[PDB]
């Protein structure tokens, strides 16, 4: 069924012009949507009610919206109102024109140490906000760390997020990200899906000899078997890793394809 070329709502009564396709995400599709009056551009999640015919799944999205709506931080994807018609459910969000930290990883492999410091810092700060406000993200990944024209990390995607395992699962995801950034391959990545689950359970990984000792230290603790021995969000920024070597305040857009000089 056709998705309308213009998008209007009974609430705000603003008109959104359906522009260019941006990508898929399960049952969700994203389009660059423009406000027809202000000319302000947004990322519009469009989910059909045909995928939301079930009362069970319909909760997941109304839980996610409720949590995203309450958020306002310079490191979390800006929530900007949701609505629905008979056919589709629409979510209006902050536009991040530089795709995600996944695309960066795939194109760069192992980033330089000062880059990962920067990306981690900005990411961790948003995770602090979340954690301060009783929110656990539960699904932090590179695909979820969105990048804008200023190379600013903005955490999105709360499909599996909850409000109050506890907070220290988010600290684990962050360990993975830091690993994948510094090393260039995910720490538990394998071809077989079931194998991956075993690796996690048994805690099977090894940080290569080539990685900085201080860096491999922070990684190991963020990945520690005992969740209660993982560092708290606040304890991360203060770590030697962020405070030892160079930590740039801004990154060029060139970092998307080539290392900075
Ligand atoms: C304007 O900046 C963007 C560009 C693109 C893009 O160029 N995608 C290419 C288009 C061509 N096809 C062949 C491959 C992906 C994609 C997303 C952009 N921005 C952009 C995307 C955004 C957001 C903000 N801003 C938010 C918030 N959530 N999402 C979001 C949401 C979903 Cl459901 C899926 C994806 C996915 C993946 C993908 N294919 O890259 C992203």
UniProtKB/TrEMBL annotation:
Keyword annotations from UniProtKB, A to Z: ATP-binding, Cell cycle, Cell division, Cytoplasm, Cytoskeleton, Kinase, Mitosis, Nucleotide-binding, Nucleus, Phosphoprotein, Repeat, Serine/threonine-protein kinase, Transferase
Locations listed in the record: Cytoplasm, Cytoskeleton, Microtubule organizing center, Centrosome; Cytoplasm, Cytoskeleton, Spindle; Midbody; Nucleus
Kinase as UniProt keyword: yes
GO MF term set: ATP binding; protein serine/threonine kinase activity
Binding positions (ATP): 45
Span of domain Protein kinase: 16-242
Gene Ontology CC terms: centrosome; midbody; nucleus; spindle
One example of a Gene Ontology biological process annotation: retina development in camera-type eye
Protein family: Belongs to the protein kinase superfamily. Ser/Thr protein kinase family. CDC5/Polo subfamily.
Protein name: Serine/threonine-protein kinase PLK
Residue window of the full protein shown: 24 to 310 of 595
